[PDB]
């Protein structure tokens, strides 16, 4: 409750201002404070939470990849010893990234998921849970890499099961969940065939449902379908 003295509505207003100012760390802190008020989040508020943390962890992941690449080049044949600094700094960034992922997972566990009864909210939060375990898996190397991977898979799978029962195949959350689960298969689980099959089946089932949509919904769905197609083009 570092934001404990601020009104819920003011935290949401400030999160929107922080987004406009591209102050994503602030945005995430405001949205964490809003979640900790204990009320469920509306559709727009869930999007604000997700956008905030995706930007924060996205910057950390990009930095981790830069540093990991420098570190791997230093541990090659013919490389001059550079001292412990590259590893130490990569570790610092890695720990910070893990801390953000743990914070998001903690919000989902206390108590966003358990109070989420509608399909749109439950699928949204379970997709988030899969995504943040996936980010943990990207940097994992020790006794728990397998368990982290299984936690991501389990969250995505529960979200997929709900989305297939409760949402049309063009629903943008269902589409983005399938996109990200396919990326999990390709990049984390060493299952490129499963990634390709999921992306193809998702795209084809969405295509067959586009006729039911308004112009605005058609634009929303086809945008994500193009991302599935982009991945299929890279993978095949």
């Amino acid at each position: 409750g570092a934001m404990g003295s601020m009104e819920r509505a003011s935290l949401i207003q400030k999160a929107k201002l922080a987004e406009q100012a591209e102050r994503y760390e602030d945005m995430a802190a405001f949205m964490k404070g809003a979640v900790e008020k204990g009320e469920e989040l509306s559709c727009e508020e869930r999007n604000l939470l997700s956008v905030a943390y995706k930007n924060v962890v996205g910057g950390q992941r990009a930095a981790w990849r830069v540093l990991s690449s420098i570190e791997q080049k230093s541990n090659e044949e013919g490389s001059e010893e550079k001292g412990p600094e590259v590893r130490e700094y990569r570790e610092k960034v890695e720990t910070e990234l893990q801390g953000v992922c743990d914070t998001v997972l903690g919000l989902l566990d206390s108590h966003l998921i358990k109070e989420a009864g509608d399909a749109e909210s439950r699928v949204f939060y379970l997709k988030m849970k899969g995504d943040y375990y996936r980010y943990l898996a990207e940097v994992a190397t020790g006794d728990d890499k397998k368990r982290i991977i299984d936690s991501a898979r389990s969250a995505y799978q529960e979200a997929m099961d709900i989305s297939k029962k409760e949402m049309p195949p063009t629903n943008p959350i269902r589409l983005g969940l399938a996109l990200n689960f396919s990326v999990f298969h390709y990049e984390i689980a060493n299952s490129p065939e499963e990634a390709i099959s999921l992306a193809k089946t998702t795209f084809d089932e969405a295509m067959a449902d586009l006729h039911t949509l308004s112009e605005d919904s058609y634009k929303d769905s086809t945008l994500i379908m193009q991302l599935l197609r982009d991945n299929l083009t890279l993978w095949t």
Partner: peptide
């Protein structure tokens, strides 16, 4: 391979 960008509300 791209996940949902998801960085703009």
């Amino acid at each position: 391979a791209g996940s949902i960008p998801g960085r703009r509300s």
